[PDB]
Swiss-Prot record:
The chain holds residues 1 to 55 of 380 of the full protein. The lineage of its organism: Eukaryota, Metazoa, Chordata, Craniata, Vertebrata. G protein-coupled receptor for peptide hormones apelin (APLN) and apelin receptor early endogenous ligand (APELA/ELA), that plays a role in the regulation of normal cardiovascular function and fluid homeostasis. When acting as apelin receptor, activates both G(i) protein pathway that inhibits adenylate cyclase activity, and the beta-arrestin pathway that promotes internalization of the receptor. APLNR/APJ also functions as mechanoreceptor that is activated by pathological stimuli in a G-protein-independent fashion to induce beta-arrestin signaling, hence eliciting cardiac hypertrophy. Residues 1-30 are extracellular. It comes from the Eukaryota. Glycans are attached at N15. This is Apelin receptor.
């Protein structure tokens, strides 16, 4: 449970219901909800790193 009761509980603020500190412009609720299950899925860095092999054969023009 990691109690660690000292200065990490309602001791200041921590935005309890602000919802107006990083939403007043909605820039961190629609971007971190798609670029996740996508950016690291439809590629994961294995599409622009491996598939290349099937192309590095001749950056110019193969099909001799």
């Amino acid at each position: 449970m990691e109690e660690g009761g000292d200065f990490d509980n309602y001791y200041g603020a921590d935005n309890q219901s602000e919802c107006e500190y990083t939403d007043w412009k909605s820039s961190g609720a629609l971007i971190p909800a798609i670029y996740m299950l996508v950016f690291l899925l439809g590629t994961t860095g294995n599409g622009l790193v491996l598939w290349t092999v099937f192309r590095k054969k001749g950056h110019h023009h193969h099909h001799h």
